[PDB]
């Protein structure tokens, strides 16, 4: 799996 | 938001 | 039927 | 390994 | 036009 | 929401 | 079922 | 070969 | 006609 | 350089 | 012949 | 530029 | 792992 | 929307 | 070029 | 905007 | 205290 | 001064 | 808090 | 699981 | 060694 | 190559 | 001594 | 100027 950092406001990295 | 394509098995499309 | 593209985020396929 | 698109319904990518 | 995906088999794009 | 692939010309992708 | 894409000339999604 | 997409509709990949 | 996806960056299809 | 699919509403691949 | 989408991680479509 | 998609075998995305 | 599109020319998903 | 770090040379976070 | 951080354990930027 | 990183717990960037 | 980067998936930092 | 990460699309530091 | 960095020379990390 | 960041020499983040 | 951020104020990167 | 973290103002990575 | 992160492509620190 | 990180104990972030 990979991190992203999104928003949609908090921007939190996503373990994905 | 963007959408990515991850397993961890099924490949999905993710909405984040 | 037709393959639509939808999420509710998982996008998937669905058969309509 | 390969991905297919199958229905499981939801139509998805799947590992092989 | 949107390009629809759908079958009545093969899945074909059709242009609408 | 489902994305939907038309005409606008440019091809792209839109979320309904 | 599953979706294949074959030829046999036109390239063709095909539901399996 | 390539693969090209194009509509006469089915737009429909053909093998090139 | 056919599909072509470019770009000058947005990568878009054009109706060629 | 990549591809994303983003929207912020058209979907579209950047040439990032 | 059918083509599959398979990785060895560059995933290339397959001939088949 | 745009994207083909052509056998090299491998099919694999082309920017031209 | 994901699969991203990218270059650095052949445009290849890679399993990451 | 998500950020992406990226070059095409400077290396920056995009939002996208 | 982007970087992304993936893992497969060690969690690597990598360079793609 | 800009991206902050603050407790709220769990520390988290935020967008301002 | 210490902040760790931990997730159960958003990555949070946690003060400990 | 303070650095400060903005965007207004490139996120830069900011010296404040 | 906030964490904030800043130089009076060190950058350091403040707990606000 | 947790992220910390470590000397194996190569410094890599790894995922406890 | 491993890189922990604490504080004790400044958060500081401590190499143990 | 390696990323330094440089005021060009902006503060932006750069690859050396 | 620094730590600077430099890749031959996974992105590793290095210790100087 | 640029940042550097380094220890001589704490690492820390240097304006050059
Ligand atoms: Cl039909
Ligand atoms: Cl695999
Ligand atoms: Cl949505
Ligand atoms: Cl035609
Ligand atoms: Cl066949
Ligand atoms: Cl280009
Ligand atoms: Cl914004
Ligand atoms: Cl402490
Ligand atoms: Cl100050
Ligand atoms: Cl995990
Ligand atoms: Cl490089
Ligand atoms: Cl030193
Ligand atoms: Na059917
Ligand atoms: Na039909
Ligand atoms: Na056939
Ligand atoms: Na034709
Ligand atoms: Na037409
Ligand atoms: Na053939
Ligand atoms: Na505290
Ligand atoms: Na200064
Ligand atoms: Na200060
Ligand atoms: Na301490
Ligand atoms: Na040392
Ligand atoms: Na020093």
Do not use: H, S
Request: with cysteine; proline share 0%.
């Amino acid at each position: 799996a990979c991190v992203f950092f999104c928003e949609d406001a908090a921007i939190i990295g996503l373990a994905v």
